[PDB]
Each structure stands twice: as structure tokens, then as C-alpha cells.
Amino acid sequence: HMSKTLQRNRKMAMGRKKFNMDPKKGIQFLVENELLQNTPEEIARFLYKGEGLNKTAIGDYLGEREELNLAVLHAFVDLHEFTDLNLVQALRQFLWSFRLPGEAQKIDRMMEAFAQRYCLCNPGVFQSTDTCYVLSFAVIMLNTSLHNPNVRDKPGLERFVAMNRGINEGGDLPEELLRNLYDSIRNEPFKIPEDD
Ligand SMILES: Cc1cc(O)cc(C)c1NS(=O)(=O)c1ccccc1
Numbered sequence: 001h002m003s004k005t006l007q008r009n010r011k012m013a014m015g016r017k018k019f020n021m022d023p024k025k026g027i028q029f030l031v032e033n034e035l036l037q038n039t040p041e042e043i044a045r046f047l048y049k050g051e052g053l054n055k056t057a058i059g060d061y062l063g064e065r066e067e068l069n070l071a072v073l074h075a076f077v078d079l080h081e082f083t084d085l086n087l088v089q090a091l092r093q094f095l096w097s098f099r100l101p102g103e104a105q106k107i108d109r110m111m112e113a114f115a116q117r118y119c120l121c122n123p124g125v126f127q128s129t130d131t132c133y134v135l136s137f138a139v140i141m142l143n144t145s146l147h148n149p150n151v152r153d154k155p156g157l158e159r160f161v162a163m164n165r166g167i168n169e170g171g172d173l174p175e176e177l178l179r180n181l182y183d184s185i186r187n188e189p190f191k192i193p194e195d196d
Pocket of ligand 1: 140
């Protein structure tokens with residue numbers, strides 16, 4: 001009843017603080033105190049809700065190499081609903097849900113999982129998941145090029161189109177697809193979580 005519930009609520013709050021200090025210790029405390037079930041899906045749902053969790057700490061946890069963390073990463077990406085979204089719309093959602101700069105192997109795992117999910121959700125768009133992966137990074141790079149004033153550039157649509165030749169199973173992506181992505185980034189930069 002009430003005392004048990006009040007204690008649990010505070011211990012949940014403490015668990016979130018512990019998570020932000022060190023994700024593994026945070027999850028351990030929650031699991032050991034029966035505040036979170038120790039399944040990949042339940043941990044993923046906990047991270048997806050992200051209540052009081054630092055997005056850098058979420059990315060940290062999702063980027064760990066061990067089996068359970070890989071499984072949580074898979075389940076976390078599965079919670080994302082990309083059906084009928086274009087690649088940029090999907091990226092906006094995905095990239096807002098966690099942060100993880102300059103960890104190449106970790107980002108590779110995360111973006112491959114994203115690519116697989118996007119293509120599964122939208123089987124008509126990219127016949128090859130490699131196409132999706134490469135184009136995803138092209139969009140991220142385009143965002144930086146167009147909106148970071150440190151970057152000289154401002155590549156035009158025609159350059160963006162040229163940079164992506166031949167990645168559609170040896171063919172090209174429809175120019176209208178590329179234009180739509182380019183224009184979407186041009187008109188609205190990615191909202192990127194700040195360093196928490
Ligand atoms: C998407 C992004 C773009 C940026 O310009 C900066 C940051 C920190 C992020 N987020 S990021 O975690 O560094 C990242 C995620 C996925 C792919 C590449 C990078």
C-alpha cells in the first residue's frame with residue numbers, strides 16, 4: 001500500500017539518477033529492487049520513454065558490446081515506427097531519442113539497426129539496406145554542411161545528387177527522393193540532443 005509505493009517511487013527516482021551517473025549501475029539498481037523487469041524489451045521501453053534520463057547515458061547503454069545491451073538496442077529500434085515516413089522523417093525521430101558522438105563502432109551498430117528497421121518498415125523504398133545506411137549518413141553530413149557555418153560549402157541539390165550516384169544496387173536513387181530529402185534538411189535542420 002502507501003508506504004511501499006512511496007518508497008518505490010523515491011527508489012525509482014534514485015535509479016534514474018544512478019543511471020545518469022552510470023547506465024549499467026542504474027539498470028542494476030532498478031532490476032535488483034524490482035522496479036524494472038530484466039528483459040531486453042522492458043529495458044528498451046524504459047529507455048524509449050526516457051523519463052529523467054540523460055540522452056547521452058541512453059546512448060552509452062545502447063552502445064555497449066555485451067549480449068544484453070545488443071538485445072536492448074535491437075528492441076529499442078523496434079519501438080520506432082517508421083512505416084510511411086521518409087528517410088529524413090525517420091532519422092529525426094531516431095536521432096532525437098539518444099546521443100553518442102565519436103564512437104565509430106557503436107554508431108555503426110546503431111545506424112545499421114536503424115537502416116534495417118527503416119527498410120523493414122518501408123520495403124518499397126530501398127531494395128538494399130546498404131543504400132539506406134549510406135544515404136542516412138549522407139543526410140547527416142548534408143545537415144552539417146548546410147547548417148554549420150564552419151563548413152564553407154553549402155552543397156547544392158545537384159552536388160548532393162552527384163555524391164550519391166550508383167548506390168542504388170549500382171543504379172541511382174530517384175532524383176525526386178533525393179530532392180525531397182535535401183529540401184527537408186534545407187528547410188529544417190536536425191534537432192540534435194545537446195550534450196547531457
Ligand atoms: C546525428 C548527430 C549529428 C551531429 O551533427 C552531431 C551529433 C552529436 C549527432 N548525434 S550522434 O550521436 O553523434 C550521431 C548519431 C548517429 C549518427 C551519427 C552521429
